[PDB]
């Protein structure tokens, strides 16, 4: 049988020739029995003085923690990232120090929509989270499997998710809400084209690219800075499932992703991604036609060639799923000195948003869990006593700054980068930004005829459930994209209507 | 379209001719805009003084609460229970006071295994929770769709669930663990026969019976007591899905149950259950062949006729799903004066187990949520300040008992019932109890030939994934049940092997 | 006896001629007894089936919620705020709409240092929190009893509190940490003069002024804006305790504040504060000598006359202490359209800081507690399901924005005010700002000789416990203030040394 | 200066000749500065992209955990317990295995009434918690400084505490509630005599005895059992403060206990307690005049001589207060094989009560904190994933019992002890038990005349604040004790009245 099917047997194979341990309570008390409760005779009530039953049950009651607000489903792995090119001219970060550096990494694949226990094979953006344990602490690159996103305003992310998830009264999936929100916000027409294309349903998790999709800013040792995007493309080649094959797999194995990834890791065919960077200088950022920090826009390849940096390989399965996938925390705020944030609105939103949900779900001291703890660095600061602190709490060191008792002092070299902006502070409306150029280029340059047919078929198949006027608004936006696009969509609609 | 598909439209239909309200923050502050964040110019970073974005995001982060440890999936409804017979000779409870009493009820259907978001149509015991708002507070009847259960010892319930759920390392469903636990505990051979029979997959939720399955004890006004079981059978007739139809529906609509129940409630075809009681006197309990409080045994119909009491009808959908299904709490401990607990070990376990998980998941003051609050009675006790108390905290009344300031005093009439037991207090082993008689009667009396064929087919189809020696132990237990049973199972096994 | 001593008797006096209620469980089940547990005979163990004991104990275990990080001790009251002057030329807020408006208010007095249960009469800044239930939601004015504060940088507030509180290893109060932090940050020399003056220990809570101390910004109906400060001064006259009287009261009645305030409210002598505003125009803000938004600076009275607005009166005691003082939440972010935040760094910090601790301590839905709920307005937004939501969750309304189902839409009139700033975005150092002018004016103009003697005595009495070199640095800062000041401090020091 | 005054200096003395560390964020990111926030120019608002401020503030907000429901104030120490006599004839426990065994121990002193931050020197029972890290897991002996307690029924403990704590409406201490509850429950007259005697206020914490006060049961290797009580008496001699000295110290140093204990531990005068056992055989338990398991009764010394076992010495201060005193959990349920619970009602209540509050306050996985973790044993069981699990979660081992993959199996030798009880299961009333004999013996045998005078003075001084009829009921109970007692109390009363 497959490794995922012969897991516990392998455990018995590894733990041969050693005697089985003694079943004890949480507090090391060895127990008499765990196959019967204390009673008053054979047909009598229970006694409170049966402590083992009470302890076991009271710990069993609290086995669940709040699922993530988004990307609930998940499959994780561990590996090491390796450098192959010099980019020290761009960054000071110890992750790009020299050639031949092994940095431990954790990775997690997720589905933005599906809750804990849904069928994985569904038309939804896949999430690709990477965490590097750099010598200067952690770095979290939280990417999507698409180079863009539905919206460009952070204040709309809650509503968006509310539309993508179940109904408030019926508690069902409703295409009505999804298509209403999509038609009202035209800035999404691009991402929709990506979502309903052939690359919408990837082959498990080893056959899909991953994109940073955020305009980061690198600073060199000299203090100069350039804007950049991170990419990483698969070495196993892009592979995607037909709608019928995904439909069959959603019934056969609802968790095909986790099974495939685990079988591949236990088999020895180590999956690998190649790491690329797009670089842009400040003058180019000033002379770019669109807004160079808009999340819905991409950078054309011709004007911005890719630059190889390194590769990712995953060579370890999680010893336990819960402690290494359910309890892992990715903060886009964890950026080492050498990688800064930009004026990109969505990145600014995420910097504040992520740690709050991490404190709610895991616990106020989530940074002390061994999967999150930065063991390749040293933690020393003026954070103190919180709920469930598993460390020594840094002993009796002074806990106020500044002081005069030789306490930890700031590093003057890790200062941030400064750049001047001009204009009033107010609310700017961005609903008037371009939405039709890049999607048109994607339509008439990237796709062939058969893939256009499949795309229109998928969109019509998912859109046939909406109301009449939402359908009219959607097809109006699509004919705004291109006449052929809208005409095909509308034709298949009246075929379904 | 169907009501579940035309929900929000109906809302717009109900709220016609009234102007749309003003979008405000949590604290009633009317907002300027919710379509853009404060920036420093058009391409500048965000400001902290954008309070609305911070508030919205920080509330969006905490939208998830820990899912139930079991029975995560759910569909709820509201109705009223109505009496049609006099059982005042048996109970003092105000729910059975007289003929013509309308008691408000909440009901919830669930699946013991499937987490939040799985396909509903699966071979697993369905849970049937009812809550009566009796004039003397709440009463929670937490039943199964089968008259029995897998085990008879409460200390084994955690392990059982751990076997029924995902693997700890691979995080997949493993038939290995399930069948190992089932073969090691022969007391389950009965329930398995129920689970893998034709009634294992019911038709939505309106086509399945519900059973209390616990030996309760009723006490009259005179103080005399009799043991009893509660039943309630559907008026729409038993209906079940073929394995192929359930397989297709698990892909088409993963939430067929909620959809069907909601469409039926909104259509007007009010589903109804008939309420029956089995009664037994103390002498009968002393002269019963098996243990009359064993959870794996049933009471033969001939010796114990059914007694009609009333009917349940569901005539209201939840106004909001989360506040009326996600936040409802059923405690088998909430039993009004007139319905007592018995020496049944599993009922004793549940009495302590349920409130603990309810305090963990919802909150220490979960009894103040309008869906749980006993509005048909008066709450007055010496419970005080806790986290998030939404009530007046009963004002400045004395908070200690006893006192001399005319505070709430105990009701001397609601005393419990007392009965003497003989024998030492110790651990009794119950693994030597009968496991083969009732299952044999179920096999050779209840079933026809075709249903036997289907049962053996289903068991073999689910068991073909286990190891060799677990298969040998399972077929050994089955041949212990009956030779034909085991022979058919083994034949289909070597066909699959 | 005094009302605070004859509280519960009065309850018995109010509830005369009505029969005592029935003691019930949380779920309305009337109980048999609450003076003995179920046992197996007279000298036997307990039974689990004693549900009432389990429920009572399990609710008693969770009676504590995390105390506030600061201002733990507290005494609260309720009243109404009344207007007496027209300031509509300055603000649009419905709280200053016209003359003769009654706005319900809640107020709370606290001590920044002392934990829950310490002696109130101590040398520490007193906190004065007011909450108006304006027709456009809540407004929280969270003031101090001094017009200034120790620091001017928000990032230093944690360290500051850590110094003011107990030692990490010994868990005692240490003057060493306090005086080290004070000497290292000279910007505090002003507030210290206020803290160790005669007005440091007020007479209970009805004999102290209260100051907004934050530079707010008002906007009129025309859209023009002016900077302002809020003041409110007592009508009972400033009264302060001698160090010996406060020392005696700290032993006699550790809670003198709560007792005095409650006795005064129950006696009928309704305490009252007069509400004043300081106003400044943008040109004045540009031509001000110091930084007009510095928290350590005041505005000289001569150049900025006070403007009366209204008065506060407290005419109601809390019906229950816990539900009306322990569970009240003041957010400086709750500012109605008409009162904006300024570039004041500390106000910006507080806007983000307060709601986070409020979500941690109370609960994610703390805005649903009747003491915090804005009942004088209407809540309608796209916030949804959270832990322990006591409301109807706004029923089955659409939960995404924008939509096309006549949902709540933004109010275009409540837009914020915009003003341009020039200069790079970076870290500015403020440790070089003036610290000696206003403190010198306070010393040689405000105080007489005897009060100077008392101030120097108090500072020396509290400073005699520090190390030698911390003493040298403190007296160096004081001689930087003025030679006589430092010389007196040093003289009394060598007297104590 | 004293060690408690020269703590942090000593740290600087220990960390001489090493360079100060680098101040980093929780996630190892070294920081630029912590003395100023990011602004838009010198007088501009803050930016969200200042991550360090957000992280620091959000962690500072959650620095508080719910204080214990009782015994909030505390002072802790660490040491080792050493055996000096053979009691293997009585117990099998590895703590009493042989002579010369060093078992690590943690100890904590507390005050049952005073909240976190009150003056320690007050008339209230002191709590003495000891935790042994035995080779077979932890053992928690949670004793009082008196051999008795106020009540004998667990269901009354909440009400009792509610009376001892602050008023619900006024939030003050009220002698009315305390004396009403004491007069209504005469079973307390004994403990009151102990509480208001000279030994009510001990000299710090090194000058008071400690008593198990619970009737435990020991079982030998042979399986025979005997009832027992644990005692431990100080080697520094009983020392107590006069009411005037305690009054002065409550103003001078509110935390005299922690200061004294820490100074003594850092000075080298290692405090020591001598460990004694009272033993009783089953026949003696059957022929005892009173109820031998009543919490309000003691065992006369003459009939039951003390048996020395070992001594406790404290030779280590807590490295950090919070992680070693605020986060320590004592469960009277943690009893190694060899020390059992008895039919004592209060011990049965505590066995269930303690772990629930421990799960609420600390966290569902509180047994993983290094101060609570049983490092002298091995934990291996079927408890799994919970909130904030800091361990490896025992890797991919099977998580269900029983199984067939060589998993941890129960220890058949650690079985519990069984004994038969006779009589019905019901509610027995114990308010008719003797309350006057032992208190009379304590009065006329243990005390001299001067101590009687002091006792009556203290009781009158605390009782002068109650109502008239509560005073009459109290003096009636006291004259029930003895005529002279009541007459003295009443005389001093009319002197105060
Ligand atoms: N309360 C009880 O005692 C129950 C007993 N049984 C079975 O009846 C056996 C003999 O007791 P007896 O008094 O003769 O019961 P009866 O034969 O008198 O009554 C038959 C019962 O079996 C139910 N039943 C029939 N087919 C199925 C099925 N495929 N899945 C689930 N339930 C089914 C019937 O439901 P329906 O009412 O729709 O006919 C009915 O309740 C027992 O061994 C037990 O297995 C089953 C359920 C309840």
Coordinates of N, CA, C and O in Angstrom, one line a residue, chain B residues 311-351:
Chain B
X311 N -46.9 15.1 19.6 CA -46.2 15.2 18.3 C -45.4 16.5 18.3 O -45.7 17.5 19.0
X312 N -44.3 16.5 17.4 CA -43.5 17.6 17.1 C -43.7 18.1 15.7 O -43.8 17.3 14.8
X313 N -43.9 19.4 15.5 CA -44.0 20.0 14.2 C -43.0 21.2 14.1 O -42.9 21.9 15.1
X314 N -42.3 21.4 13.0 CA -41.4 22.5 12.8 C -42.0 23.5 11.8 O -42.2 23.1 10.6
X315 N -42.3 24.7 12.3 CA -43.0 25.7 11.5 C -42.2 27.0 11.4 O -42.8 28.0 11.0
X316 N -40.9 27.0 11.7 CA -40.1 28.3 11.5 C -38.7 28.0 11.2 O -38.1 27.1 11.8
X317 N -38.1 28.7 10.2 CA -36.7 28.6 9.8 C -35.9 29.6 10.8 O -36.5 30.5 11.3
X318 N -34.6 29.3 11.0 CA -33.8 30.3 11.7 C -33.7 31.6 11.0 O -33.3 31.6 9.8
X319 N -34.0 32.7 11.7 CA -33.9 34.1 11.1 C -32.5 34.3 10.7 O -32.2 34.9 9.6
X320 N -31.5 33.9 11.6 CA -30.1 33.9 11.2 C -29.5 32.5 11.6 O -29.8 32.1 12.7
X321 N -28.7 31.9 10.8 CA -28.1 30.6 11.0 C -27.2 30.6 12.2 O -27.4 29.7 13.1
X322 N -26.3 31.5 12.3 CA -25.2 31.5 13.3 C -25.8 31.6 14.7 O -25.5 30.8 15.6
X323 N -26.6 32.6 14.9 CA -27.2 32.9 16.3 C -28.2 31.9 16.7 O -28.5 31.9 17.9
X324 N -28.7 31.0 15.8 CA -29.7 30.1 16.2 C -29.3 28.6 15.9 O -30.1 27.7 16.3
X325 N -28.2 28.3 15.3 CA -27.7 26.9 15.1 C -26.3 26.8 15.6 O -26.0 25.8 16.3
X326 N -25.4 27.7 15.3 CA -24.0 27.6 15.7 C -23.9 27.9 17.2 O -23.0 27.3 17.8
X327 N -24.8 28.6 17.8 CA -24.7 29.0 19.2 C -25.8 28.4 20.1 O -26.2 29.0 21.1
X328 N -26.3 27.2 19.7 CA -27.4 26.5 20.5 C -26.6 25.5 21.4 O -25.7 24.8 20.8
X329 N -27.1 25.3 22.6 CA -26.4 24.4 23.6 C -27.4 23.4 24.2 O -28.3 23.9 24.9
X330 N -27.2 22.1 23.9 CA -28.1 21.1 24.5 C -27.3 20.4 25.6 O -26.3 19.8 25.4
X331 N -27.9 20.5 26.8 CA -27.3 19.8 28.0 C -28.3 18.7 28.4 O -29.4 19.0 28.9
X332 N -27.9 17.4 28.3 CA -28.7 16.3 28.9 C -28.9 16.5 30.4 O -29.7 15.7 31.0
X333 N -28.2 17.4 31.1 CA -28.3 17.7 32.5 C -29.6 18.6 32.8 O -30.1 18.5 33.9
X334 N -30.0 19.4 31.8 CA -31.2 20.2 31.9 C -32.5 19.3 31.9 O -33.0 19.1 30.8
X335 N -32.8 18.8 33.1 CA -34.0 17.9 33.2 C -34.9 18.4 34.2 O -34.5 18.5 35.4
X336 N -36.2 18.8 33.9 CA -37.1 19.5 34.8 C -37.5 18.5 36.0 O -37.4 17.3 35.8
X337 N -37.9 19.0 37.1 CA -38.4 18.1 38.2 C -39.6 17.3 37.7 O -40.6 17.8 37.3
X338 N -39.4 16.0 37.6 CA -40.3 15.0 36.9 C -39.6 14.1 36.0 O -40.2 13.1 35.6
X339 N -38.4 14.4 35.5 CA -37.6 13.5 34.6 C -36.2 13.4 35.2 O -35.5 14.4 35.2
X340 N -35.8 12.2 35.7 CA -34.5 12.0 36.4 C -33.6 11.2 35.5 O -34.0 10.6 34.5
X341 N -32.3 11.2 35.9 CA -31.3 10.3 35.3 C -31.3 9.0 36.0 O -31.9 8.8 37.1
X342 N -30.7 8.0 35.4 CA -30.7 6.6 35.9 C -29.3 6.1 36.2 O -28.3 6.9 35.9
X343 N -29.1 4.9 36.7 CA -27.7 4.3 36.8 C -27.1 4.0 35.4 O -26.0 3.5 35.5
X344 N -27.7 4.4 34.3 CA -27.0 4.2 33.0 C -25.7 5.0 33.0 O -25.7 6.3 33.1
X345 N -24.6 4.3 32.8 CA -23.2 4.9 32.9 C -23.1 6.0 31.9 O -22.5 7.1 32.3
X346 N -23.5 5.8 30.7 CA -23.3 6.8 29.6 C -24.0 8.1 29.9 O -23.5 9.2 29.7
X347 N -25.3 8.0 30.4 CA -26.0 9.3 30.8 C -25.3 10.0 31.9 O -25.2 11.2 31.8
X348 N -24.7 9.3 32.9 CA -24.0 9.9 34.0 C -22.8 10.6 33.4 O -22.5 11.8 33.7
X349 N -22.0 10.0 32.5 CA -20.9 10.6 31.8 C -21.3 11.9 31.1 O -20.6 12.9 31.3
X350 N -22.4 11.9 30.3 CA -22.8 13.0 29.5 C -23.2 14.2 30.5 O -22.9 15.3 30.1
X351 N -23.8 13.9 31.6 CA -24.3 14.9 32.5 C -23.1 15.9 32.9 O -23.3 17.1 33.0

